[PDB]
Write a protein that binds this ligand. Structure first.
Ligand SMILES: Nc1nc2c(ncn2[C@@H]2O[C@H](COP(=O)(O)OP(=O)(O)OP(=O)(O)O)[C@@H](O)[C@H]2O)c(=O)[nH]1
Ligand SMILES: Nc1nc2c(ncn2[C@@H]2O[C@H](COP(=O)(O)OP(=O)(O)O)[C@@H](O)[C@H]2O)c(=O)[nH]1
Ligand SMILES: Nc1nc2c(ncn2[C@@H]2O[C@H](COP(=O)(O)OP(=O)(O)O)[C@@H](O)[C@H]2O)c(=O)[nH]1
Ligand SMILES: [Mg+2]
Lengths: 49, 298, 430, 442, 430
């Protein structure tokens, strides 16, 4: 029976790995959003000039 | 200098950009095809998108207004200057940087057939972690300005990512796009309509009398009057779609969202299998013929 | 368990507009008022801040008050402005003149009956009422005078509920108005009797947050009001989502205030990360605890290193271990033991909530009760006394009708508040 | 045969989820209350009766009530996976919390909710024919657990009288802490708990964290691990009522054998084969090894060292494949050891129990599967050290009346603090006096 | 067992950039920061120098400090510069002026708190901290003054850890600056108190290595910094890979220093050989030991033949027999017996590590404690005394605020260090 216990543990390990990949993608997305904000500000200044 | 593969890419861009057989290209084509959103400085967020137009004018107009266009040699030496300026760049690698910056700025490669949207990941690959949860947008090409002007109509967050775009026919792949893929081309926004949270079916045909469908990907809040005739023809309510004879359904998978799950959900995990096994064990013990671990009830 | 919000004056209405944008986004409410969320967890506590209109619609439990309609017309013209119920906008016909006495005595008594009528109409619709939330500045004119008037009336009418305030107080350096000391002193006098808990923010501290931590090139009031809306929406997060160790505004008050006059708190919010250094640091409980106590991230000009912590509270959002929280709070108390008041054996309360703010894996909001707050009040009192001795602008207030005796009473009460903070600040083991 | 469980507050409801998860998986009832069985004969299996009663349609329902003052945790139970098992009346919720104030639970709010609780307990007791006790799970650190737990135990003690009440209690850890006002609530709780409980088991979260770090290989444990361990302990103690065995032990035998004097009813708890699946294939698990394990201070679930005191009585529960001769040999070997000492007035220091059903393995659990286990509850004078540190922390806070204005404003006289502190001081003196060797007084 | 690196001043930043290139190459870390290695042996000790950031990435545990950003902008522009965490770069707004007193008293005390805050934040993150590693030049301005200031502060805050320094010191033959003697004398005075073990390198010795051994026609500072990065990465190599006879920085210190003031060591590295010559000679333990002890290959101007070895240490990298090492060290000690101090029965410690640097079958690094190091300090002291009698440039330092008494103290302390080394040299006894 302890064999099957180990198998279920392995499945849980894979699931948490997937969650970690998700969170990394989210961090990259937020960096992109900040870059877009800076882009808009520079465009407005150029139009003024 | 430029490697031969980069020369082939430049040749392809020039030929695909050249209308007619004459070896000249109008400056309006240069303006329309060039992609500012893939400019390195703009992507990193330290230059304004309108500054690229002035650079293009400064490099090209002097010969464009004189000879009526640009030949191949001026284009090639423009890219030679591009490489020379990229040589002193801050990036660790130089060849790949030049290659993918050329590909990005000149909009070459493979694009989804309607509305010409660049895909983020290969279309045949199932969606990864984050993109399996973020909602997608419904997009179609405008008609008052002809295709190739890169102006589209957009409705935000009305498509679930539960399906894979690789199963759709090639002429309908570009109808659904991610928010990150809309950068670099003009958008016109449309207004939703008041409704509840219902999910709606998408159908189409691939042969006369044969239909294929994908179940429940369109929100019921898409307002049908704003859409063109064909686009609202392909959208139909679920049970009506079910009643259609000889219909096939594209496989869809729903993925968990790790932003909205609780701690108490950990308790009831894997219990039906264990309780089924326990019931089998207890009835086997009751019937007899158990010689190891046996049930010890009353 | 529903909260009613009141927004007063220009600063209050501007902060409120961003707050209701942030809250509507977190619960997935469209600016038309329609629900567009993607989990039942969003819907099941929407009642806490929204009232239900007939078939789908949501209305935000807020009263908007101002003396000149310029701000209300600006918020109505904004992208979410339509959500607000029209009858909830209260305005007069002539300005406060940046004068406390006008806001308290002349236009105040004229309007005040209509605001109490609207708040009671809004309050009596709730099935059970939790505390009120009020946003205003102390340096202004209608904000200070009419806000404190309304606070006093609500404390008369609802003495068994909770009263919570967020308040902006004038920096000594970024002077936008000459008569700031009078308005601040009179408002602090009103607050120490009426309020149950009051949080104080310096605009200079928000500028230092933006410039040093976020390194923004060209900040605007939208950023400052976003920082404020972030903390405001964080304090209530445990009210409206499940968690492993629930907490509540009343439990925070009971654990933070040792004695009833000591109810002024500092605020901070931890996972602020710079625009170009995000790939370099993963979120973790050590990172949040280290950033959370860094004075760069604290929203007042006084620094904790010049005072001592009586109590502190941390509210964590996300799926995380309790062991890491308890052992971090123990290690920080043990390693820096001279900065914690010694006759309390454990100064920090923790709380854990499952649902983080959108787009962050984890976040914490920090509330601290620290004696260094006395430095702000002392500075305001020095500036007030210097002008009052010679009567620098007093004829405006006296012409409205104030007795001069009010200024000496208010000064004495503020000086006693400073003294009470000072005795606990400088005690030692003797 | 049957026992009814009362869960109060947050710790008690969350520990209840783990307990009912274990009892369902151990008996075999489905999450919807069903119980599959493919043989038409051999249905005479009354063992569920201790915890479940069946309806005329054959659905099973459990003998429990869930009590809380805030709605969130019970509403989470109402919407979870076990929605269909409980009758909705059993999940009781008030409108607002006791805000970490014992005074609000005891005086203002619990007096309104207590009569509904008593009506529910009556509704359970009417569906009974041999009740032999109540099991209560709570923490004394929080407001509603302290105030409503005391009020409910007082009312139960007047109405039901002699019937036994067994408490599992989480006390505030000696240096891990979650709230500032823990000492006041724990002292006032202990004052009421002294008069109105038959046996009280003491647990400290700091000990279960140490045990889960050292024995199991979990770097970041969470409350679900501790609650699953507590559920296993309760299942071990109640297994003696539900399955066949060589030496059975009824719940009245614990109180008769472990409690020498009516005030001395606080017991320590420990569990032996806490081991991981990877470690489980490296070791044999004989009777003597696990018997030696329950006596090591590394095994305790409360932060006290029994080597600083004297044992008065020990109760050893063995479950699984054990033979009585091995239990006798193990207990005689333990008795030979020099670091284990018994008071000279207790020559027969041990009670033994032997049950054939091995401990159940839970699909998401962290314990390994083992053929035998032993669980120990023991009464020892070392616990007096646990009260003295709480008394020092209370005295430190009360010397300056640090928070008293909340309690006095919500309705309690200041005198009640001094009365409770003097009564717990007398309990400390009782534990000092009972432990003095009679050979010294001649 | 975690090492913290500090790189200070121009020399420090350049050596650090080349060192972190060599270490990142040896552990197979891409310049994007992604692990791309091909054996678990590479991964299993990455923690020693790198912290793990989220989704794969590793960041190097180093603080970069300088007073004018020109160098810092140059290192950020280099090929590996991106790997470094942005918050780890500390710089001011005005230069050291090539003046020790400015670097120590005016800009030092102004900047030092942000460096100590970063170093403490970084140190307290380790689960167990091993010693610090310090790189700086003594001839510069910010390097000498602020480096020794920071070293003194770290010795106050972490006296139980190890403090290790690599230091570049001027030359009488190829100086870049006139006021070198003051900065060198004051820095050596600070170092002899604060440091636990210090290695000294002359640029003249690196030029002779490059020109004579490698036969480079036109060497550049990249070659000198490669030689330094090779020895620096070699001393710690046994800390972070398996071996038949493990060694550690603390074990080296315990075996090399007989008495606590005698902690200045000479360095060499053996498998140096020109691309033309490499086809002519295979690697073997006799060849490495012979090259290792040849004075041509040692990185100081002083020659061992003019002094005596108190103690020495050799760290071997590669798969090799213990028999060859022990018998070689015995044979060298027996055959040259007049050059070894007689009251120690065995002066050499050996250590063996399995994993060589990439592309070499075997290598050894040598650390030697020899009294001929006294000749360098005496020479610097001579030039200082020549300059000081005439008050040649003293008004700059006195104008910053220094008392002249510091100069006489520093001169006396350096003279006593030279005397102590000379006394232990004492050729013969009686
Ligand atoms: N083992 C365990 N202990 C818990 C758990 N939750 C809280 N505790 C502990 O119990 C004490 C807090 O008691 P609570 O249950 O939160 O108090 P309450 O019953 O909710 O009372 P109120 O706050 O007034 O609602 C602290 O010592 C916590 O460490 C849990 O899930 N498991
Ligand atoms: N942080 C912040 N401060 C503001 C904002 N608007 C005004 N202030 C400050 O508040 C003070 C002016 O008070 P004001 O709100 O105009 O008083 P009112 O006229 O009574 O509403 C000045 O110190 C302004 O700098 C805002 O949107 N955000
Ligand atoms: N070996 C070596 N020496 C250097 C390097 N850079 C500068 N130096 C020497 O160090 C001295 C200059 O010190 P510097 O680093 O500029 O001091 P700083 O201005 O405080 O940083 C001179 O003797 C230079 O020859 C280098 O990369 N390698
Ligand atoms: Mg509670």
């Amino acid at each position: 029976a302890r064999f099957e216990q180990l198998a279920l543990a392995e499945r849980r390990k894979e699931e948490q790995q997937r969650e970690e990949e998700f969170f990394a993608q989210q961090r990259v997305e937020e960096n992109r959003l900040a870059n877009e904000r800076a882009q808009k500000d520079l465009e407005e200044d150029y139009i003024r000039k | 200098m430029v490697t031969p593969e980069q020369a082939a890419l430049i040749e392809g861009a020039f030929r695909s950009m050249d209308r007619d057989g004459t070896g000249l290209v109008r400056l309006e084509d240069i303006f329309r095809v060039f992609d500012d959103s893939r400019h390195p400085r703009v992507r990193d967020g330290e230059l304004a998108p309108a500054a690229t137009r002035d650079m293009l004018m400064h490099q090209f107009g002097a010969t464009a207004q004189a000879h009526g266009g640009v030949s191949f040699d001026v284009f090639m030496r423009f890219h030679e200057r591009m490489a020379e300026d990229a040589a002193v760049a801050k990036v660790n690698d130089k060849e790949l940087f030049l290659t993918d910056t050329i590909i990005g700025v000149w909009r070459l490669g493979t694009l989804l057939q309607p509305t010409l949207i660049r895909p983020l990941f290969p279309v045949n690959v199932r969606p990864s972690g984050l993109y399996a949860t973020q909602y997608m947008s419904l997009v179609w090409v405008d008609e008052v300005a002809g295709p190739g002007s890169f102006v589209v109509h957009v409705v935000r967050d009305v498509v679930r990512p539960i399906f894979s775009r690789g199963d759709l026919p090639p002429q309908l792949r570009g109808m659904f796009a991610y928010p990150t893929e809309l950068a670099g081309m003009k958008i016109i926004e449309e207004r939703l309509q008041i409704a509840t949270q219902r999910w709606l079916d998408f159908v189409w045909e691939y042969e006369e009398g044969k239909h294929a469908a994908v179940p429940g990907i369109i929100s019921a809040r898409v307002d049908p009057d704003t859409l063109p005739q064909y686009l609202r023809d392909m959208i139909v309510e679920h049970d009506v779609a079910k009643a259609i004879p000889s219909l096939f359904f594209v496989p869809t998978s729903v993925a968990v969202n790790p932003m909205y799950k609780r701690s108490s959900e950990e308790y009831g995990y894997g219990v039906p299998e264990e309780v089924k096994r326990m019931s089998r064990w207890k009835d086997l013990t009751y019937s007899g013929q158990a010689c190891g671990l046996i049930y010890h009830g009353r | 368990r529903e909260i009613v919000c009141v927004q007063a004056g220009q600063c209050g209405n501007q902060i409120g507009s961003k707050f209701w944008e942030v809250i509507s986004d977190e619960h997935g409410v469209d600016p038309t008022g329609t629900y567009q969320g993607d989990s039942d967890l969003q819907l099941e506590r929407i009642n806490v801040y929204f009232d239900e209109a007939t078939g789908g619609r949501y209305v935000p439990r807020s009263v908007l008050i101002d003396l000149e309609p310029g701000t209300m017309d600006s918020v109505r013209a904004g992208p979410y402005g339509q959500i607000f119920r029209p009858d909830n906008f209260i305005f007069g016909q002539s300005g406060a003149g940046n004068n406390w006495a006008k806001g308290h005595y002349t236009e105040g008594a004229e309007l005040i009956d209509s605001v109490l009528d609207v708040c009671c109409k809004e309050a009596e619709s709730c099935d059970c009422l939790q505390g009120f939330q009020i946003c205003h500045s102390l340096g202004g004119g209608t904000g200070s005078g009419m806000g404190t008037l309304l606070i006093s009336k609500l404390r008369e009418q609802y003495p068994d509920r909770i009263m919570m305030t967020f308040s902006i107080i004038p920096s000594p350096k970024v002077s936008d108005t000459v008569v700031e000391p009078y308005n601040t002193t009179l408002s602090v006098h009103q607050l120490v009797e009426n309020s149950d808990e009051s949080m104080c923010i310096d605009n200079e501290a928000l500028y230092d947050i933006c410039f040093r931590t976020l390194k923004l090139t060209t900040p605007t009031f939208g950023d400052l009001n976003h920082l404020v809306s972030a903390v405001v929406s964080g304090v209530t997060c445990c009210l409206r989502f499940p968690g492993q160790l629930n907490s509540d505004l009343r439990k925070l008050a009971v654990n933070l205030v040792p004695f009833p006059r000591l109810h002024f708190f500092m605020m901070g919010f931890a996972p602020l990360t710079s625009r170009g250094s995000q790939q370099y640091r993963g979120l973790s409980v050590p990172e949040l605890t280290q950033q959370m106590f860094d004075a760069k991230n604290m929203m007042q000009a006084a620094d904790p290193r010049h005072g001592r912590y009586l109590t502190a509270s941390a509210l964590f959002r996300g799926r995380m271990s309790t062991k890491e929280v308890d052992e971090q709070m123990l290690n920080v108390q043990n390693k820096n033991s001279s900065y914690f008041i010694e006759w309390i054996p454990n100064n920090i309360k923790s709380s854990v909530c499952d649902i983080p703010p959108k787009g962050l894996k984890m976040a914490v909001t920090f509330i601290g009760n620290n004696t260094c707050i006395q430095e702000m009040f002392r500075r305001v009192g020095e500036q007030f006394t210097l002008m009052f001795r010679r009567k620098a602008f007093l004829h405006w207030y006296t012409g409205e009708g104030m007795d001069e005796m009010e200024f000496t009473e208010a000064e004495s009460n503020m000086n006693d508040l400073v003294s009470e903070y000072q005795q606990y600040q400088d005690a030692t083991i003797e | 045969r049957e026992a009814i469980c009362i869960h109060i507050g947050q710790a008690g409801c969350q520990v209840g989820n783990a307990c009912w998860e274990l009892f369902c998986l151990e008996h075999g009832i489905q999450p919807d209350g069903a119980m599959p069985s493919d043989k038409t004969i051999g249905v005479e299996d009354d063992a569920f009766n201790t915890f479940f009663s069946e309806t005329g349609a054959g659905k099973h329902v459990p003998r429990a009530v869930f009590l809380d003052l805030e709605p969130t945790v019970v509403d989470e139970v109402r919407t979870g996976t076990y929605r269909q098992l409980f009758h909705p009346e059993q999940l009781i919720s008030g409108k607002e919390d006791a805000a970490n104030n014992y005074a609000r639970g005891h005086y203002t709010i619990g007096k309104e909710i207590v009569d509904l609780c008593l009506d529910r307990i009556r509704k359970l007791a009417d569906n009974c024919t041999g009740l032999q006790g109540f099991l209560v799970y709570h923490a004394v650190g929080g407001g509603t657990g302290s105030g409503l737990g005391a009020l409910l135990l007082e009312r139960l003690s007047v109405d039901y009288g002699k019937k036994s009440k067994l408490g599992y209690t989480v006390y505030p850890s000696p240096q891990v802490s979650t709230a500032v006002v823990e000492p006041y609530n724990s002292v006032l709780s202990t004052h009421s708990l002294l008069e109105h409980t038959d046996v009280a088991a003491m647990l400290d979260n700091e000990a279960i964290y140490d045990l889960t770090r050292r024995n199991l290989d979990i770097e970041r444990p969470t409350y679900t691990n501790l609650n699953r361990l507590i559920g296993q302990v309760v299942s071990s103690l109640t297994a003696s009522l539900r399955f066949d065995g060589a030496l059975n032990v009824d719940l009245t035998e614990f109180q008769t054998n472990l409690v020498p004097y009516p005030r001395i009813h606080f017991v320590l708890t420990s569990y032996a084969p806490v081991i991981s699946a990877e470690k489980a294939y490296h070791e044999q698990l004989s009777v003597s090894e696990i018997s030696n394990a329950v006596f090591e201070p590394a095994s305790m679930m409360t932060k006290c060292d029994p080597r600083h005191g004297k044992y008065m009585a020990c109760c050893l529960m063995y479950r699984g494949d054990v033979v009585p001769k091995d239990v006798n040999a193990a207990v005689a070997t333990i008795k030979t050891k020099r670091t284990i000492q018994f008071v000279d007035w207790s020559p027969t220091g041990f009670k033994c129990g032997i049950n054939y059903q091995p401990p159940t393995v839970v699909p998401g659990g962290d314990l390994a599967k083992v053929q035998r286990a032993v669980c120990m509850i023991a009464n020892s004078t070392a616990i007096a050290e646990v009260f003295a540190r709480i008394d020092h922390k209370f005295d430190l806070m009360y010397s300056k009346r640090a928070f008293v204005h909340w309690y006095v404003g919500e309705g309690m006289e200041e005198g009640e603090f001094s009365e409770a502190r003097e009564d717990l001081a007398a309990l400390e003196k009782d534990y000092e006096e009972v432990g003095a060797e009679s050979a010294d007084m001649d």
